C-alpha cells in the first residue's frame, strides 16, 4: 500500500517542523519530496523543513551575487548556496568624544572579527544552517547562517558522529505526532469503553438538550422521557454492568438508568448549571442561566458594594459577595451558581471586573 502522507493541516503539530533537524547528507539527498506542498520534505512521516550540516569544504565557486560550497560529511556531498549580503549605506565614522571613539574602535574590531569568521577556503570545516531547495533537478541548501568552525583537535566532529545515531534512534525513528490522540473525537460510537465516560457524555448531551429548549424547570423523570437520551444511554457497557438482578432484569436496568441519570444531573449541579430548592421534589431542578430574579438581586447587592461603607474601597471580593448572598438571599447558595450568575451578568454589560475575583458596579 502506498503510504498516504500526513495531511497538510497537522504539520505544525510536530515539534520537528520548527527545529533545525540534524540529518545525514545521504538522508538529505534520499528523502522524498511531499506532493501537497513543494519545498517541504518527509522522513518517516516527519515533515522536515530545515536542516543542519557540518563537514569539510571540498570546492569553492564564486559568482557576482552568491557563493557556492561543497560540504562533505563522510556520507555524501551536497552544495550549499551562501547568499551575499549587500553592504549598502555603510556606517560613517565621526571623531566623537573619547567614549564614542572607543565604541567605534570596538565596532571596527567586531567587524574585523566577523569578516575573519566568514572567510572560507578549501579544506576548512564549515557549519551550514538553512532550508532545502531544488534547482534544475539538483538538491541544495540555501544557507541562512554559516561560519567557519575552528576545530584544531577534531573533537567537534567526533562528538557529532557519536551523537547522531542516538538522536536518530530516540527521535527520528518514531511513528508520528499526537493529533487528537487516537479517536479522541467522539468515543468510537455511543458504545464507548468507560462507563463514567458514558455518564459524562450523556450529562452534557442532556445539558445541551435542556439549553436548546430554553427549559425553565424540569424533572429527572421528564428527562427520562427523552427517547434520544435514553437511546444514547442504552449501551452494552451499562447493561452488562447492571446484571445484579435476575427476576427484575427490566426493573434493575431501569434502576441503573435512573442512577446514571442522577449521576449526570449531579455532575451538572456541580458545575452550577442547575440548582435545587427545598420544595419537596427530590428531582426538581432550575436552570441557573434562566433565573432572572437571582441576577437582579445579585446586581442590586453589588450596586451597593454589598452594604459596605462608601469610604471603604469600592467593589467586593468573590468570598465577600458569596457571604453577603448567603446571609441575605439564601443559605443554600453554591459557589458555582454564583460564579455563573456573575459571568452572565457581566456578559449583558451590567458589572465590570477590575481585578480577578473582584467586581464593581458601573
Amino acid at each position: 500500500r502506498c503510504e498516504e502522507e500526513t495531511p497538510s493541516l497537522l504539520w505544525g503539530l510536530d515539534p520537528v517542523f520548527l527545529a533545525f533537524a540534524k540529518l545525514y547528507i545521504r538522508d538529505i539527498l534520499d528523502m522524498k519530496e511531499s506532493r501537497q506542498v513543494p519545498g517541504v520534505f518527509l522522513y518517516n512521516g516527519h515533515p522536515i523543513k530545515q536542516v543542519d550540516v557540518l563537514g569539510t569544504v571540498i570546492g569553492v565557486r564564486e559568482r557576482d551575487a552568491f557563493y557556492s560550497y561543497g560540504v562533505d560529511d563522510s556520507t555524501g556531498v551536497i552544495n550549499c548556496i551562501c547568499w551575499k549580503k549587500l553592504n549598502t549605506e555603510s556606517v560613517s565614522a565621526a571623531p566623537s568624544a573619547a567614549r564614542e571613539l572607543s565604541l567605534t574602535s570596538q565596532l571596527k574590531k567586531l567587524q574585523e572579527t566577523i569578516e575573519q569568521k566568514t572567510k572560507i577556503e578549501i579544506g576548512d570545516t564549515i557549519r551550514v544552517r538553512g532550508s532545502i531547495r531544488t534547482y534544475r533537478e539538483e538538491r541544495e541548501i540555501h544557507a541562512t547562517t554559516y561560519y567557519k568552525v575552528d576545530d584544531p583537535v577534531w573533537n567537534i566532529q567526533i562528538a557529532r558522529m557519536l551523537e547522531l545515531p542516538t538522536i536518530y534512534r530516540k527521535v527520528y525513528d518514531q511513528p508520528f505526532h499526537s493529533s487528537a490522540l487516537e479517536k479522541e473525537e467522539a468515543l468510537s460510537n455511543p458504545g464507548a469503553l468507560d462507563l463514567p465516560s458514558l455518564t459524562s457524555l450523556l450529562s452534557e448531551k442532556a445539558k445541551e438538550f435542556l439549553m436548546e429548549n430554553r427549559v425553565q424547570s424540569f424533572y429527572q423523570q421528564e428527562l427520562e422521557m427523552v427517547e434520544s437520551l435514553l437511546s444514547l444511554a442504552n449501551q452494552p457497557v451499562i447493561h452488562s454492568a447492571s446484571s445484579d438482578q435476575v427476576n427484575f432484569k427490566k426493573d434493575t436496568t431501569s434502576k441503573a438508568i435512573h442512577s446514571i441519570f442522577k449521576n449526570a444531573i449531579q455532575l451538572l449541579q456541580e458545575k452550577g448549571l442547575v440548582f435545587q430548592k427545598d420544595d419537596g421534589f427530590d428531582n426538581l431542578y432550575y436552570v441557573t442561566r434562566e433565573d432572572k430574579d437571582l441576577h437582579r438581586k445579585i446586581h442590586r447587592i453589588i450596586q451597593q458594594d454589598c452594604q459596605k461603607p462608601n469610604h471603604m474601597e469600592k467593589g467586593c471580593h468573590f468570598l465577600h459577595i458569596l457571604a453577603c448572598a448567603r446571609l441575605s438571599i439564601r443559605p443554600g447558595l453554591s459557589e458555582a451558581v454564583l460564579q455563573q450568575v456573575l459571568e452572565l451578568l457581566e456578559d449583558q454589560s451590567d458589572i465590570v471586573s477590575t481585578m480577578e475575583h473582584y467586581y464593581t458596579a458601573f
Partner: protein, 364 residues
C-alpha cells in the same frame, strides 16, 4: 498510637462517658455544643500500651493519610483540608503581617516528578516549631488550601494543623546534577521534568533592556540621581539591571528563553571589563531599550552584536520552566498560521511556544 487513660481514684461510674454539667466542665469556643466532651483532670495520667496486645488495631499504623495529587492541585476542590509529606527546601522570613514562607518539595509514590509548594505561617502561631529547617523531612496534616489571584496554589497554616518532624538535616549537603533531556520531551505530557539541561543553539534575539534604577524607590536614575529624589529616596544609590529574550532550539523543538541580571552578560559572551564599560556608558542617558521583533553608536554597536555569529553560537543551558508547577490553567487551543515555503502559502495548526527561564549559561 493507642493510649490508655489511667485516671486514679474511686470507681465512680459514668466518669469516662460524659462531662458532668454540675461539676468542673469547660469547653473551648469552637466546641460549645458538642455531644461528646470529656475534660481531663490534673491527677489523671496517660500510658502507652504494647504492640503485641493491640496488634490488630496497631496493624493500621500505615503511612499517615495524604490527599491525592489531583485533589491537591485542583481549584474546583471545594474542601479546604489537605495533608502531605514533603522535604523543606528553603525557609525565609517575611516582614512588612509577619510570615515565614516555606518552600517544600512534595514526596509521593504516584508521580516521579513531584511539584513544589509554598506553606505560609502567620502571626497566631509564630514561635515556629523546632526542627523546621532546610533539608529535613516533615509531615504536614490538615492544612488550609487557597487559590491566589494568579491561579497559584499555596497552603496556609490554621489552628487545626498538626506538624511532625521525621528526619534531621544531613550533616553534609551532597550535590545532584540536573537531568539531561531533549527539548521535545517537554511537549509530550507524560511525566516530564521541569528542571533540566539541554544543548541548544541560539537563533535570534527579540529584545534587550538595560536600566539604572534607584535602590529604594526602584525608579530610573540619571547620573546617580533619582527622578523623585527628595520625595521618596533619602540618598543617591544606583544599581544596574538587565533583561533579554533569546530564541533557542536543539534539533528537536523550539523554545524562547528569558534571562536576567548577570546571565545577560553570560549569554552575550562578554568579559567582565567589557560588561562594566558597557554599563558605565549606559549610565549616562539612563535607559537603553531595543525591540528587534514584536508588537547613536550604542544602538548600532548593540544591533551589530545581536546579529553577528559571535552571539549566535552553540551553548549549554540549564533552564527551569517558567510556569510554576503549582500554577494550574490549561486553556490553550492550537492556533493557525500561514507558513509559505515555495511561493505557495499553506495553513497549519501550530502549538503555543515554550517559555523557559535561565539559571546558568556555559560555552562549549
Amino acid at each position: 498510637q493507642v493510649y490508655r487513660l489511667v485516671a486514679p481514684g474511686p470507681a465512680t461510674p459514668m466518669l469516662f462517658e460524659k462531662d458532668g454539667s454540675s461539676c468542673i466542665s469547660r469547653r473551648p469556643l469552637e466546641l460549645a455544643g458538642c455531644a461528646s466532651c470529656l475534660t481531663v483532670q490534673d491527677n489523671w495520667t496517660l500510658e502507652l500500651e504494647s504492640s503485641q496486645d493491640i496488634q490488630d488495631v496497631l496493624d493500621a499504623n500505615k503511612s499517615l493519610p495524604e490527599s491525592s495529587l489531583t485533589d491537591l492541585l485542583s481549584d474546583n476542590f471545594t474542601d479546604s483540608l489537605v495533608s502531605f509529606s514533603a522535604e523543606i527546601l528553603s525557609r525565609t522570613l517575611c516582614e512588612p503581617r509577619r510570615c515565614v514562607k516555606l518552600t517544600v518539595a512534595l514526596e509521593t509514590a504516584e508521580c516521579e516528578f513531584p511539584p513544589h509548594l509554598d506553606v505560609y505561617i502567620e502571626d497566631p502561631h509564630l514561635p515556629p516549631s523546632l526542627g523546621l529547617l532546610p533539608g529535613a523531612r516533615v509531615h504536614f496534616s490538615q492544612l488550609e488550601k487557597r487559590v491566589s489571584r494568579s491561579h497559584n496554589v499555596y497552603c496556609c497554616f490554621r489552628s487545626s494543623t498538626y506538624v511532625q518532624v521525621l528526619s534531621f538535616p544531613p550533616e553534609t549537603t551532597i550535590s545532584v546534577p540536573l537531568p539531561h533531556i531533549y527539548l521535545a520531551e517537554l511537549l509530550q505530557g507524560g511525566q516530564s521534568p521541569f528542571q533540566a539541561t539541554a544543548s541548544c543553539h541560539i537563533v535570534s534575539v527579540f529584545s534587550l533592556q538595560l536600566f539604572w534604577v534607584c535602590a529604594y524607590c526602584t525608579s530610573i536614575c540619571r547620573q546617580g540621581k533619582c527622578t523623585r529624589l527628595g520625595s521618596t529616596c533619602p540618598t543617591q544609590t544606583a544599581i544596574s539591571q538587565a533583561i533579554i529574550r533569546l530564541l533557542v532550539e536543539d534539533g528537536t523543538a523550539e523554545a524562547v528563553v528569558t534571562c536576567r541580571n548577570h546571565h545577560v552578560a553570560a549569554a552575550l559572551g562578554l568579559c567582565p571589563r567589557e560588561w562594566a564599560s558597557l554599563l558605565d556608558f549606559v549610565q549616562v542617558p539612563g535607559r537603553v531599550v531595543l525591540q528587534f521583533a514584536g508588537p547613536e553608536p550604542m544602538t548600532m554597536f548593540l544591533w551589530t552584536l545581536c546579529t553577528s555569529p559571535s552571539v549566535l553560537r552553540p551553548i549549554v543551558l540549564s533552564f527551569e520552566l517558567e510556569r510554576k508547577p503549582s500554577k494550574i490553567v490549561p486553556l490553550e487551543p492550537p492556533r493557525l498560521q500561514r507558513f509559505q515555503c515555495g511561493e505557495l502559502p499553506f495553513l497549519t495548526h501550530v502549538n503555543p511556544r515554550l517559555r523557559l527561564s535561565c539559571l546558568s549559561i556555559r560555552e562549549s
